[PDB]
Structure formats: C-alpha cells, structure tokens
Amino acid sequence: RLFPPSADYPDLRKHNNCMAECLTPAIYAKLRNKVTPNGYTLDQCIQTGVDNPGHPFIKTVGMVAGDEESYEVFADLFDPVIKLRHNGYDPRVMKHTTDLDASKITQGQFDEHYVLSSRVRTGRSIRGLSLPPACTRAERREVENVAITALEGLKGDLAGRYYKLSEMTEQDQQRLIDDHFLFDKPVSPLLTCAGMARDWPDARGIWHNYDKTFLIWINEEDHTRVISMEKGGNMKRVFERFCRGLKEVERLIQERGWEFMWNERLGYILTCPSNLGTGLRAGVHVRIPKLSKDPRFSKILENLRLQKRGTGGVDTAAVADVYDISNIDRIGRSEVELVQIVIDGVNYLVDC
Ligand SMILES: Nc1ncnc2c1ncn2[C@@H]1O[C@H](COP(=O)(O)OP(=O)(O)O)[C@@H](O)[C@H]1O
C-alpha cells in the first residue's frame, strides 16, 4: 500500500456499531497490510461499519468476513467484536457446543390467540469457497451447484424444487416476499456496502418443499440459510423438522466431499459475526398490543436475551402491533438451549 497504515485510519466519530467501538489505531496499523489467501483485506471487512454509522431498528456489527480465513487473519478485530456482540463469549478462551437433538424440546406449543407464526433459521457455509462479500461470479455459481445437487437427495415431506431468481417473474418474487417465504432484494446499505448485492440475482434462488415449511435460501446473505416455519405456534414440531432437515442436508453435502465452515471456537462460520456459533434465530410473530406500548419493554427484552424486529423483518417497522420476537444470542449456547430460551422467553411475553 502507498501510504503509512495510519494515513488510512477511518473516521468513526458518531458510529454506533461493534466494529467502531473495538477498532484502535494499533489494531488498524497491525492489520491494514495483512491479506487472506484469496486476497480479502481489512478495509473490505470493515467497509460496511465505516459507511453505516447506525441503523434505524437494531445494533449492527459493522464488519463481515470475506472467507473462512478472515476470522483467523483479522482475529485481533473479530475477537473483541465477537465478545461485544455476543454478551461476553470470547473465542480466544471459550469453545462452542453444537446440539441439534430435537427430542430435548419435549413441550413446545404457544397460545395461538397472540402468536401468529413460528420460524427457526440458521446458515451454513461451504468450505473452500469465498463468502458473499468476496465471492466471484464463478464461486457463487459453484455454491449454487453444490447446494442444488445435494437438495435433490431430500425425500418425503422434505422433497422440494429449486427456483432460480433469474427465472422467477417479479410477480412470483413479490408474492413469496409478502408471504414471508423469500428474501427481499438486497437494497439495505449494510448489505450493499459489504459487497453482498454484486451480480444480483445471478446464482441466487430459493429451494422449498410443497407446504413451504422447509425452505433454503441460496447465495443471498450466506451460502445457505436453512429455514423451518409454519402458521401457528408449535415450536416443538418446527424444530424437529429443522433438526431433521438440517442433518440430512449436511449428510447429502458431505456425500460429495464438501465440508461446512466450522471450528471449535466459532462454531459454524458465516458472513456476519452476529450469526456465528449456531447461526440460529428461533422466533415468532406475536400480537402484543399492551406489552409493546409500555416504556419498560426494551429492558424486559435485553434481560430475557430477546431481540425486537418489524413484521417484515430486520429492515422494517411493526404493523398492527405484530412484533417479530426471537433469541438475541447465537454462540455460547447450543441450538437446543436457544430454542428453550425462546419457548420460555415468549411465554413471559404472552403473560406480560
Ligand atoms: N417468526 C416468523 N414468522 C414468519 N415470518 C418471519 C418470521 N421471522 C422472520 N420472518 C420473515 O423472514 C424474512 C426475513 O426477515 P429477517 O428479519 O431478515 O429474518 P432472518 O435474518 O432470520 O432471515 C421476512 O420476510 C420476515 O417477515
């Protein structure tokens, strides 16, 4: 690079994201010239946190990984960012336990007068291929190809079809978005500034079973986003389908020699440090008219480990008091333990 490292130091005054709160002159100077084997840089990692000083509805991380090696090469920034975002989980000293045994959720039925729908998602990355911030068009097509091939192996109620977004009409896309089945077009500046809207919709698509109760998003926010959902509040069956579907998807992918990005410190590796560990967001849509307008609601959400979101997701506000309520933490606690903290965390919200 053409200047001293410090000449490139970003202006982060009035930036309220984890990256800006952890970046120091020392860390920046030490990492500016380091690169991953695929050539991903620190400036690319942090660009979204530099360009986006806030967000209208949620606290942001302000950095993304371009590849698996980003988390090693830029550990001096990612590690304190991970600790800050995940309430003390420290990948330098701790390890993460994966647990997808659905039987340990023995009771799971919400009051259907208040809770409209129930959903469990995670993400998975394929090792050897760059993540969405950095992937070339050929890497991204390869991800689609590896995913497509594996998912044709799914049987029974998990049988489904892949739909390329390039071959889907605007009318069919918008329908699926309005019915909470398909991702929005990446217009969010968090995503665009991280390089995650490049070449859209090339190699993006949705795979789903006929009932739309097991869905997989390909190459939007991650390589894959694996989703289980339905109308109502039966979290116990939703999670049994999630665990069964996910274990099979893994086996089908592993059958051809691909591995998921994973290590013992970070659990499953994904684009954004907010989705590390389990990557798991178990949630419901809930009509909480009285509980929402109360001034102490934000304190009850942060203490119960839950996040608030709009009816149309992270970038929207609530409509008709219908709030998206799900677990805030994703690493340090297992998938089982996180589902349990959503079953309990909603019932406090249904009573209160
Ligand atoms: N519990 C839920 N029930 C029904 N739809 C949901 C639920 N949670 C999220 N969604 C839908 O998923 C889509 C993406 O929302 P987002 O907040 O980005 O969730 P995620 O990051 O888990 O994909 C939106 O269309 C949103 O309405």
Domains and CATH numbers, the chain: 1-92 (1.10.135.10), 95-352 (3.30.590.10)
Q: What is the total residue count of the chain?
A: 352
Helix H or strand E encompassing 226: strand 224-231
316 lines ligand 1 (CB under 6 A): no
Residue nearest to ligand 1 atom 3, measured at CA: 117
In contact, 44 and 134? CB cutoff 8 Å: yes
Which residues on adjacent β-strands are paired with residue 214? 228
DSSP state of 349: H
Tell me which residue has tokens 């340990």.
104
d(CA 6, CA 19): 17
Please state the atom number of ligand 1 nearest to the C-alpha of residue 116.
Answer: 3
Cα(41) to ligand 1 centroid in Å equals 31
d(CA 328, CA 301): 9
Cα(338) to ligand 1 centroid in Å equals 17
Helix H or strand E encompassing 145: helix 137-151
30 lines ligand 1 (CB under 6 A): no
Residue type, 112: E
Tell me which residue has tokens 């993400």.
123
312 lines ligand 1 (CB under 6 A): yes
In contact, 263 and 269? CB cutoff 8 Å: yes
Q: Bin 313: left if φ > 0, else alpha if -120 < ψ < 50, else beta.
A: left
Is 287 marked within a binding site?
A: no
Sequence-separated contacts (24+) of 186-189 with Cβ below 8 Å: 186/220, 188/314, 188/315, 189/48, 189/51, 189/52
Is 208 marked within a binding site?
A: no
In contact, 100 and 247? CB cutoff 8 Å: yes
Is 161 marked within a binding site?
A: no
* Experimental determination technique: X-ray
232 lines ligand 1 (CB under 6 A): no
Q: Return phi, psi of residue 232, to 5°.
A: 110, -150
CB-count burial class (<10 Å; 0-12, 13-18, 19+) for 260: middle
Tell me which residue has tokens 């998938």.
335
Is 310 marked within a binding site?
A: yes
Which tokens in the block code for residue 228? 């289980």
**CA–CA distance from 289 to each of 236, 283, 303, 309 (Å)?**
26, 18, 20, 15
Helices (H), 164-303: 170-178, 189-192, 235-255, 289-293, 297-303
Residue type, 285: H
Query: From the CB of residue 327, how many other CB atoms can be counted at a distance below 10 Å?
Result: 22
Which tokens in the block code for residue 69? 């090696």
313 lines ligand 1 (CB under 6 A): yes
